[PDB]
C-alpha cells in the first residue's frame, strides 16, 4: 500500500456475446449486487470477471514496449550506431531512431533495436 | 485556463458497490476513513464507482489542494456529487467519485421516466463534463495560454 | 527486385516499395509516374565496373546500348515513392572513403548530380554560384532569346 | 559551431535537455539551434566585414549606399547561411528526411537547411537545391502580396 | 514408429471423370462448430424472393437448430487449382477436383431488431437515451 | 446532449450518388456480415489493443437501430435515391449500386463482394491509425502521391 509502483490491469472490451457473435455490455444485477454483461440483442447474460468497465488516458504512455517490431531493424535508411553490445546479446551494431509518430508528443529519448540475432531485443536509454 | 483535463492522468470506472470490501484491496483504508459520511443513504447513493488518478508535477505546478479540486467540482456540479479523497502524504493523488440520487422520490411510480439508461453511462456524460467543462483557477477562455517575460 | 534486374517484368515499370514500421508492400505498374535512373550498390561498392564503359566505348561500332546497361541490372528506375525508402550515395568518391564518415547502408548512387536540372536551367553555366532566383529568372529570359 | 549543435544533440538524445519556460522539447531544441547557427553566421560575416581591404569595389558599393548591403558581402564572402521556409528549417518532406540523400532523423545543420559554403565557393547538389527552396519562398511571396495590397 | 523414423510412399490416382461435384465447405474457427452435436441437417437454395448462382441455406437438426448461410466464391481458382487427397481401403491415395468453394456463416435463431418501424425515427430522436427498454418492447 | 460527453469518434461514410451521409456500419450491414465481432474482424484484426477496441465502440452503438442486410439497403436506398415507396427495388437497386459503384477498381460483381468489405475496412483502419496519431498524417502534394 503504497504511493509508488504501477496499475496495468488488462482492459477488456473481448468476450463477445458466444450465442450470437456481437458485441456485450456490462449491466447490473440489483438482486445479487454483482456486474453482468448481456448481449443487447438477445436473452443472453453472462457474470463479469473484473469490476473495470471502462478507463480513459494512462499519462505519459511510453508504449514503446509494442508497435515496434523487430523487423525494422532491415531499413538502410535507419542508422547504425557503433554503441554497442544489445543488453542481451553479446553483440554491437544496434539500429536507433527518435520517437516517430504524432504522438511523438515532444520526447527526443532515443529507442534502440539491435540489429544482431540472439535477441532482437529492443530497449531505451 | 487550467481544466480538470489537464491535471488529470487518468480515469477508471469501477462497479464498486461494497465500499467496505472495495475492489482494490489497496483502496481500502480510504474507505475506513470514510464511514461517517451519509452512511444511512450508501444503501441509496449508486453503486457506481469513478476513480481518477493525477499528475504530480500539474499538481506542483498549479500548486492546487485535493480539497480545492474537490470543493470545486461538488460547487461545479452540486450536492448529487459525492466526492471523498485520498490521503494527501503521497507522490500519487487519487479522487474516488460516486453519485447521488434524489433518494425520496426513487419508489418507482410510474416507470421511472429516465428511460432506464445505465447509470455508469450517466457517469461517462458526468465524466466527459468533468474533463471539458471543470474550470479550477481557470478563471476565463484564453485557451491554455500565457507567457511570463522579463523586461529590461 | 533480383527479378526486374533480370527483366522477368518491366524495370521501367514496376515500382516496389516496402513500409517496414506498417509492414506493407505496395507495387505500382500504373502509367504515370515520374522516375529517373541511378547507380546499383552492393555491399557497400558500387556494381557497376568500368568493364561495361569498355562496351560503352565500343558502341561507336558495336551494338552494345543503354538497354544492355539496363540489362546488367546494374542501373535501375526509381519513382518518387520508392525514392523515399533508398539510401542514396552523392557520387562515388563519398561512397569509396566512407569507413565511419557517416553510413554503410547505400543502395543507390547519383549518375550525375547536375541532372536535377531541367532543360533551359542546364545552358546556364554555374548555376550554383548565383543566388537562385537569380536562376529562375535566366530560365525564363534563355527560353525567350533568339538566335 | 556544427561541432557545438552535435553538442545540442547528444545533450538532447540523451534526455539531459530540459524544456525552456512557455515552450515544448522541439521548439527548445529548435529555438537553440536556431540561436547557434545564426549566431554562427553572424560572427563570421563580422569576421568577413573586418576583412575588407579599403580598396576593394565591393565594400565601396555597400558603404556609400549604392546597392545591397553588409549581409550580402557576407554571403559573398564568407558563408550563404541558413535556408528556410515558413520561418522554420526545411520541412521533413520525405519520411522524417529532407533528401533521400541523408539518413533518417539527421536535425544535424547540413541535413536540414544550413549552407556552409560561400556564392563564391559553389553550393554543394543538397545546398544548391535547398537553396532553391528558400528562392521560391521569395518568388511566390512576391505574387501573391502583390495581388492583396492590390485590393 | 513414426515418432523415430518412418517412410510411406502410395500411389495417387485420378479418375477420368467423377460420379459426382465436390465442393468446400468452410466455417470460422471462432464459430467453433463440432459435427459430434448435429444429427441432422437439411441444405437448400434459397430462391423463393425471386438456382445454381443462388446463396446456400443450411438448416441444421430441427427448426430450432442453427442455421447458417452458404456464399459461393467467385471462382475454385484464378490461375491454379485445388484438389482433394484421400485414402482408400487399397491403401493407395485417390485424388479428386474441386468444383466450387462457398463460403459459410453462422445465423442468429431468433434476434430480429427490424428498422421498418419507426427505428429509424428513433434514430432522428436517438441521443443514446434507451436500449433495454426498446428491445422489451419489441 | 448528455449522449456520450464526446461525439469526436462518430466515423460516417460519404457514397457516390448518395444524398446522405450514413455511418461506415451500415456498409458493413450491407455487406451482409452481421456479426459485430466479424466487423470488428475487417476494421481491425488486432483486438488485442483496448484502445483501438474503444476507438470504435461508439460507431457500433450506433448500428443498433439496423440489424439486417435488406432493412440496411432499404436504409441506404432512401438516403440516397429519388423516393420510391418500393423498398425492394430501393434494396436491389442500392445493392447494384454497392456491386458496380464503390470502390469500382476492387471489384465490378457479386463474385469479388467479399474483396470489397475488407477494402473498406482497410480505409477505417488506415484512418483509426491516424486517429491514435501513431500514423502521418499523409502529406498534401508528396510527389510519390501524384500522376
Not at chain 1, 538502410?76 to 539500429?95: F, I, M, N, S, Y
Request: glycine share 6%.
Amino acid at each position: 500500500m503504497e504511493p509508488d509502483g504501477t496499475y496495468e490491469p488488462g482492459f477488456v472490451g473481448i468476450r463477445f456475446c458466444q450465442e450470437c457473435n456481437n458485441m456485450l455490455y456490462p449491466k447490473e444485477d440489483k438482486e445479487n449486487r454483482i456486474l453482468l454483461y448481456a448481449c443487447r440483442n438477445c436473452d443472453y447474460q453472462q457474470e463479469a470477471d473484473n469490476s473495470c468497465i471502462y478507463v480513459n488516458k494512462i499519462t505519459h504512455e511510453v508504449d514503446e514496449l509494442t508497435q515496434i517490431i523487430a523487423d525494422v531493424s532491415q531499413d538502410p535508411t535507419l542508422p547504425r550506431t557503433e554503441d554497442h553490445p544489445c543488453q542481451k546479446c553479446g553483440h554491437k551494431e544496434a539500429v536507433f531512431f527518435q520517437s516517430h509518430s504524432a504522438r511523438a508528443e515532444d520526447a527526443m529519448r532515443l529507442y534502440y533495436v539491435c540489429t544482431a540475432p540472439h535477441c532482437g531485443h529492443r530497449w531505451t536509454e | 485556463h487550467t481544466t480538470l483535463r489537464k491535471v488529470t492522468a487518468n480515469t477508471a470506472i469501477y462497479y464498486d458497490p461494497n465500499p467496505q470490501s472495495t475492489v482494490v484491496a489497496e483502496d481500502q483504508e480510504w474507505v475506513n476513513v470514510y464511514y461517517e459520511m451519509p452512511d444511512f443513504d450508501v444503501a441509496r447513493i449508486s453503486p457506481w464507482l469513478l476513480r481518477v488518478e493525477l499528475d504530480r508535477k500539474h499538481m506542483t505546478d498549479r500548486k492546487l489542494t485535493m480539497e480545492q479540486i474537490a470543493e470545486k467540482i461538488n460547487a461545479g456540479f452540486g450536492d448529487d456529487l459525492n466526492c471523498i479523497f485520498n490521503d494527501d502524504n503521497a507522490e500519487k493523488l487519487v479522487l474516488r467519485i460516486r453519485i447521488m440520487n434524489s433518494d425520496e422520490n426513487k419508489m418507482q411510480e410510474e416507470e421511472e421516466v429516465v428511460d432506464k439508461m445505465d447509470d455508469d453511462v450517466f457517469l461517462r456524460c458526468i465524466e466527459s463534463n468533468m474533463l471539458t467543462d471543470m474550470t479550477l483557477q481557470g478563471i476565463e477562455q484564453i485557451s491554455k495560454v500565457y507567457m511570463h517575460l522579463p523586461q529590461t | 527486385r533480383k527479378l526486374r534486374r533480370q527483366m522477368d517484368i518491366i524495370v521501367s515499370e514496376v515500382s516496389m516499395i516496402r513500409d517496414i514500421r506498417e509492414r506493407e508492400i505496395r507495387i505500382y505498374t500504373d502509367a504515370g509516374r515520374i522516375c529517373r535512373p541511378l547507380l546499383i550498390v552492393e555491399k557497400q561498392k558500387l556494381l557497376l565496373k568500368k568493364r561495361h564503359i569498355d562496351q560503352l566505348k565500343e558502341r561507336e561500332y558495336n551494338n552494345y546500348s543503354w538497354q544492355d546497361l539496363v540489362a546488367s541490372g546494374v542501373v535501375e528506375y526509381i519513382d518518387t515513392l520508392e525514392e523515399e525508402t533508398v539510401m542514396l550515395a552523392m557520387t562515388p568518391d563519398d561512397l569509396q572513403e566512407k569507413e565511419v564518415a557517416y553510413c554503410s547502408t547505400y543502395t543507390h548512387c547519383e549518375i550525375h548530380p547536375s541532372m536535377i536540372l531541367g532543360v533551359c536551367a542546364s545552358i546556364i553555366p554555374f548555376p550554383d554560384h548565383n543566388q537562385s532566383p537569380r536562376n529562375t529568372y535566366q530560365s525564363a529570359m534563355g527560353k525567350q532569346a533568339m538566335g | 559551431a556544427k561541432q557545438d549543435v552535435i553538442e545540442v544533440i547528444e545533450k538532447a538524445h540523451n534526455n539531459e535537455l530540459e524544456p525552456t519556460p512557455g515552450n515544448t522539447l522541439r521548439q527548445t531544441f529548435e529555438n537553440q539551434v536556431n540561436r547557434i547557427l545564426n549566431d554562427a553566421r553572424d560572427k563570421t560575416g563580422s569576421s568577413a566585414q573586418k576583412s575588407l581591404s579599403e580598396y576593394n569595389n565591393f565594400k565601396s558599393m555597400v558603404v556609400s549606399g549604392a546597392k545591397g548591403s553588409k549581409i550580402n558581402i557576407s554571403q559573398v564572402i564568407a558563408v550563404v547561411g541558413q535556408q528556410n521556409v515558413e520561418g522554420k528549417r526545411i520541412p521533413f518532406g520525405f519520411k522524417h528526411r529532407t533528401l533521400p540523400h541523408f539518413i533518417k532523423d539527421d536535425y544535424g545543420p547540413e541535413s536540414r537547411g544550413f549552407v556552409e559554403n560561400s556564392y563564391l565557393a559553389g553550393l554543394t547538389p543538397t545546398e544548391f537545391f535547398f537553396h532553391a527552396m528558400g528562392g521560391r519562398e521569395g518568388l511566390i511571396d512576391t505574387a501573391v502580396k502583390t495581388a492583396e495590397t492590390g485590393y | 514408429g513414426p515418432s523415430s523414423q518412418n517412410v510411406t510412399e502410395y500411389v495417387v490416382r485420378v479418375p477420368k471423370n467423377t460420379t459426382k461435384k465436390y465442393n468446400i465447405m468452410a466455417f470460422n474457427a471462432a464459430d467453433k462448430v463440432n459435427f459430434a452435436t448435429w444429427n441432422q441437417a437439411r441444405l437448400e437454395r434459397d430462391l423463393s424472393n425471386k438456382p445454381e448462382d443462388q446463396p446456400w441455406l443450411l438448416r441444421v437438426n430441427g427448426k430450432s437448430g442453427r442455421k447458417f448461410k452458404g456464399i459461393k466464391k467467385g471462382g475454385v481458382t484464378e490461375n491454379t487449382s485445388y484438389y482433394i487427397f484421400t485414402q482408400c481401403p487399397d491403401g493407395a491415395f485417390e485424388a479428386f477436383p474441386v468444383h466450387n468453394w462457398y463460403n459459410f456463416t453462422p445465423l442468429a435463431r431468433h434476434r430480429t431488431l427490424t428498422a421498418e418501424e419507426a427505428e429509424e425515427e428513433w434514430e432522428r430522436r436517438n441521443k443514446v437515451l434507451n436500449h433495454f427498454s426498446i428491445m422489451q418492447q419489441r | 446532449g448528455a449522449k456520450k460527453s464526446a461525439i469526436g469518434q462518430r466515423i460516417v461514410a460519404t457514397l457516390p450518388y448518395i444524398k446522405q451521409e450514413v455511418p461506415i456500419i451500415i456498409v458493413f450491414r450491407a455487406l451482409g456480415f452481421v456479426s459485430d465481432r466479424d466487423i470488428l474482424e475487417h476494421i481491425i484484426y488486432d483486438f488485442e489493443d483496448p484502445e483501438m477496441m474503444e476507438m470504435v465502440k461508439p460507431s457500433l452503438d450506433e448500428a443498433f437501430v439496423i440489424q439486417e442486410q435488406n432493412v440496411a439497403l432499404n436504409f441506404i436506398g432512401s438516403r440516397g435515391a429519388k423516393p420510391g415507396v418500393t423498398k425492394e427495388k430501393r434494396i436491389k437497386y442500392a445493392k447494384e449500386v454497392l456491386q458496380k459503384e464503390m470502390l469500382p477498381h476492387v471489384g465490378v460483381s457479386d463474385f469479388c463482394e467479399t474483396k470489397k468489405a475488407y477494402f473498406l475496412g482497410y480505409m477505417v483502419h488506415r484512418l483509426l491509425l491516424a486517429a491514435l496519431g501513431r500514423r502521418e498524417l499523409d502529406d498534401r502534394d508528396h510527389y510519390g502521391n501524384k500522376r
